[PDB]
């Protein structure tokens, strides 16, 4: 069970890579956040911009991009292999994520055998 | 010559003991390395004016902290009324 922040990015302002502000919104909410050095670096690494729907893990700070919102100006003729348009999330900006999955002991062994051991769960080169 | 930092280690009687000293040529370097910053201040725990619960969000348009979607709707309605009245 993990607490997450989930919303659509409205504005990203960075002053100078030292300090900045991030604005996130839902269909029922909107707030602004003060960013640090590592958060700014992570946002720049993932190339998060306006219109992107992202989730941020509060504990670890990792950012994964769910999709981007559709506007009249985003009628692309060609799309990348990973881009997809999703609806703006509803509800509250802070959410709890509960994940239940079944794995075997061998899978955990293969995961922890090497740095990217989860690849051997597909290749079998354990 | 120039602006330098002098690192010094000596042998002095206490039968002898070692002491280290750091010498700054100019006061600017000393201030830069030792700003003598005062302790920081604890931020004021903001509270939502609508529901009086501890604040968790901050509406960028109104800069009014809030902790509920209903509080956000009320704040935005108040801002719309303010725009309508003042113009």
């Amino acid at each position: 069970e993990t607490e997450i922040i989930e919303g659509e990015v409205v504005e990203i302002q960075i002053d100078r890579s030292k300090v900045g502000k991030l604005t996130l919104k839902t269909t029922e909410m909107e707030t602004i956040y003060d960013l640090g050095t590592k958060m700014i670096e992570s946002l720049t690494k993932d190339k998060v911009q306006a219109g992107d729907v992202i989730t941020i893990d509060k504990a670890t700070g990792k950012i994964s991009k769910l999709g981007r919102s559709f506007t009249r100006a985003r009628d692309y003729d060609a799309m990348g292999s990973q881009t997809k348009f999703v609806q703006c999330p509803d509800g509250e900006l802070q959410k709890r994520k509960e994940v239940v999955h079944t794995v075997s002991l061998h899978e955990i062994d293969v995961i922890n055998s090497r740095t990217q051991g989860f690849l051997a769960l597909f290749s079998g080169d354990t | 010559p120039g602006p330098i930092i002098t690192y010094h280690s000596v042998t002095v009687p206490l039968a002898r003991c070692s002491r280290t000293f750091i010498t700054f040529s100019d006061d600017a370097t000393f201030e830069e390395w030792f700003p003598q910053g005062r302790p920081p201040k604890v931020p004021v725990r903001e509270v939502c004016p609508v529901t009086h619960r501890p604040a968790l969000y901050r509406d960028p348009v109104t800069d009014i902290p809030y902790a509920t979607a209903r509080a956000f709707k009320i704040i935005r309605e108040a801002y719309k009324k303010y725009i309508t009245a003042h113009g």
């Binding site: 729907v53 769910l66 559709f70 009249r72 609806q87 703006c88 | 960028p60 800069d63 303010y82």
Partner: peptide, 27 residues
């Protein structure tokens, strides 16, 4: 929950541009 639909896509495409975002006001 948040997959787009053809109806929503058509509505957004046909609708005019959204009004400009209001400037922040210290209140």
């Amino acid at each position: 929950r948040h997959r787009l639909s053809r109806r929503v896509l058509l509505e957004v495409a046909t609708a005019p541009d959204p009004p400009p975002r209001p400037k922040p006001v210290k209140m």
